[PDB]
Amino acid sequence: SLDQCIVNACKNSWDKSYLAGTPNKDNCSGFVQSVAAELGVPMPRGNANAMVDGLEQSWTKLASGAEAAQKAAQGFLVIAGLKGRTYGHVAVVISGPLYRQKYPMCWCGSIAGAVGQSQGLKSVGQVWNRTDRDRLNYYVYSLASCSL
């Protein structure tokens, strides 16, 4: 798999602060912004909801969670996003085996603390709860970030 460069961007981003005095581990939107900036990918800005509005407008949607991991394995940046009535959430999908044969591995920060956070060993199915996890949208960037 080709996602090593995406995984490195995640590791470096974890301790950065996109927002002043707010570590990226406590801010899902900020975390994805730092990941995107290292990879050189223009990313819709704002909070999670605002980010999802932008991804819906300008990024290709993937069919399934299974497909998202394949595209990640092929070195594409893939964002998992879902709007809330109050607050949404965003995560970076990485490659690897699928939890419960459905839900891809991911990296994400969260204001919720450890329960919301993932460093690549929680799936999206362990970050979002049992009702939200089957509602997820997976967006892929037009160009692969990692090469050979």
Author numbering: 3 to 150
Which of the paper's sentences describe this entry?
Most importantly, the T6SS from the Gram-negative, pathogenic bacterium Pseudomonas aeruginosa was shown to inject at least three different effector molecules (named Tse1, Tse2, and Tse3; Type-6-Secretion-Exported) into the periplasmic space of competing cells. Tse1 was shown to be an amidase that cleaves the γ-D-glutamyl-l-meso-diaminopimelic acid amide bond of crosslinked PG, and Tse3 is a muramidase that cleaves the PG-backbone between the N-acetylmuramic acid and the N-acetylglucosamine moieties. As injection of effector proteins by the T6SS would also cause cell death of siblings, P. aeruginosa co-synthesizes the cognate immunity proteins Tsi1 and Tsi3 (Type-6-Secretion-Immunity) and shuttles them into their periplasmic space to confer resistance. Tse1 adopts the fold of N1pC/P60 papain-like cysteine peptidases, which are widespread among bacteria and of which homologues were identified in eukaryotes, phages, viruses, and archaea.
